Design a protein that fits this description.
homodimer, 313 residues, alpha/beta, Protein-Tyrosine Phosphatase, Chain A, six-stranded mixed β-sheet, five-stranded mixed β-sheet, 9 helices, 16% strand, globular, signal (chains A, B), hydrolase (chains A, B), Tyr_Pase_AS (chains A, B), hydrolase activity (chains A, B)
Chain lengths: 313, 313
């Protein structure tokens, strides 16, 4: 009947049309902290005008002090150490670097880089296993080789940058552990709703966490995927909070707004429109999943429940 | 003992510090002909101010009508066809595409590209055998693969460009033949004086050319290497012409001026200074070789003669 259900639209895109072509600079390392850094203990700010929200609305903060999560963009090793130090002041539990990036990435001579393909879909369609194997192989192959690292500029194409002969290669896991943080990888595709396997994996991981665990989520920019998992965590941990309050508060501390809003993209970014719409509906479906399965201890996972309760456009 | 004689300064540079890192766009294909296109039948023009020459001087044109040579920058396949068509109106002999580029280059989906390393020295130090093997391997590896092709902008680094999955790969030899030209490759390093090996190969090639052969020389930009071989050919074929006349006329038809001039360089280009000085001295030494070895029909090759008669800085 249906080729791709709601929540799996990206599966229709062709991986061969977005293969990696350059080592993208993930962070210039000029700031002490990564971009969009925020924690669940932060004060709520005014909502961004583009979401056309009620600036007078004061969402409930119930459970935010105990939530213990944070989010940010990619970072240099030094920046991550700064994050870890800062998060250690808020807790005595393990601090996790939850890496949500499907795209292959790592560090060349301490420089955070990723193998970038159009739309940042260089690993689209790969299983987590295949994406991580590609990553390990590409990182290693760069050792003692000349590479071109560049930030993206006009038209999302390389602009300036630098050329160097790599003397050191590290995975983010190594960088996290060196910063004193535990590491957990979830290979989520950039710009789209996390897959049923991404979410099943996160929920399984969530279940094993000690009470005082602190989760620092991050993606490339620290907006789309980062806010999605932050929201999922808030819903799971504070199931009595209304959907409206979760969405407003995760937005007002510095994340994306995952509720309905007037979507307007630049003509060259019109491809994003349906993925934004898809995220709005899936966000609602996840909330329903939590509400309907919390009472029995989640004896049925998200992927299974979603197939029997498909989302609709 | 002397480590590197005059004429071989580049041998002191380390190849590993200039490895290739991007497919550089050799020509955008917007014009009908490659840049700096010129032939020995062209009228002489005013000299460029930067060379501080005598604009009143009238160079002898002795032997130019019979010289039968031309030069230009790199080109797209369509531009080469236009060149070949244009040269065919000037001769009924074989027309050669004399490719002077040591850097690995070719055509991806008809687009002329080269594997660019800093200073365009990605094949520095390699024998012609090794340079051509690198080229063959890289061009073939590009087939059915995704590549990033870009022109150089600020800092001599990629700027903009395009990404594509290659469906066709061709060597310049194939493109030359398709244009009705014979092909002859001389792997000369960009920016420096051609090596004794490059010149020995050229001289051997020159010696068995048909009387009516037309040589179309080209490099990347069509100035340094291209003019050097046009000057060498002019000297060889018209030995009675004075050095001054040869240098002025090859410059006034649109080439570089290979005589003494006030060398100027931006701070970032200060490395080029000694290479320009070296070319000036080597031009004089080659002229001396032609004058002293033409009587016996060049029984002594340039490389051998140069070691017994080293140039002076």
């Amino acid at each position: 009947t249906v080729t791709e259900p709601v929540g799996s639209y990206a599966r229709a895109e062709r991986p061969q049309d977005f293969e990696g072509f350059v080592w993208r600079l993930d962070n210039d390392g000029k700031e002490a902290l990564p971009r969009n850094f925020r924690t669940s203990a932060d004060a709520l700010r005014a909502p961004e005008k583009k979401f056309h929200l009620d600036a007078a609305y004061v969402p409930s903060r119930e459970g935010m002090d105990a939530l213990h999560i944070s989010g940010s963009s990619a970072f240099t090793p030094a920046q991550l150490k700064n994050v870890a130090a800062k998060l250690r002041e808020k807790t005595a539990g393990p601090i996790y670097d939850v890496d949500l990036r499907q795209e292959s990435h790592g560090y060349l001579d301490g420089i955070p880089v990723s193998w970038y393909g159009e739309r940042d879909w260089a690993n689209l369609g790969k299983s987590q296993h295949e994406a991580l194997a590609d990553e390990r192989h590409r990182l290693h192959a760069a050792l003692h080789k000349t590479v071109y690292i560049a930030p993206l500029g006009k038209h999302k194409l390389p602009e300036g940058g630098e050329v160097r002969r790599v003397q050191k290669v590290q995975t983010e896991q190594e960088v996290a552990e060196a910063a004193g943080m535990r590491y957990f990888r979830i290979a989520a595709t950039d710009h789209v709703w996390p897959t049923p396997e991404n979410i099943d994996r996160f929920l399984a991981f969530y279940r094993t966490l000690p009470q005082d665990a602190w989760l620092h989520f991050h993606c490339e920019a620290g907006v789309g995927r980062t806010t999605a998992f932050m929201v999922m965590t808030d819903m799971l941990k504070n199931p009595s909070v209304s959907l409206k309050d979760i969405l407003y508060r995760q937005h007002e501390i510095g994340g994306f707004y995952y509720g309905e809003f007037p979507i307007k993209t630049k003509d060259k970014d019109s491809w994003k429109t349906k993925y934004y719409r898809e995220k709005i509906v899936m966000i609602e479906q996840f909330y329903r999943y939590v509400q309907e399965n919390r009472a029995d201890g989640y004896q049925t996972p998200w992927s299974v429940w979603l197939k029997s309760h498909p989302a609709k456009a």
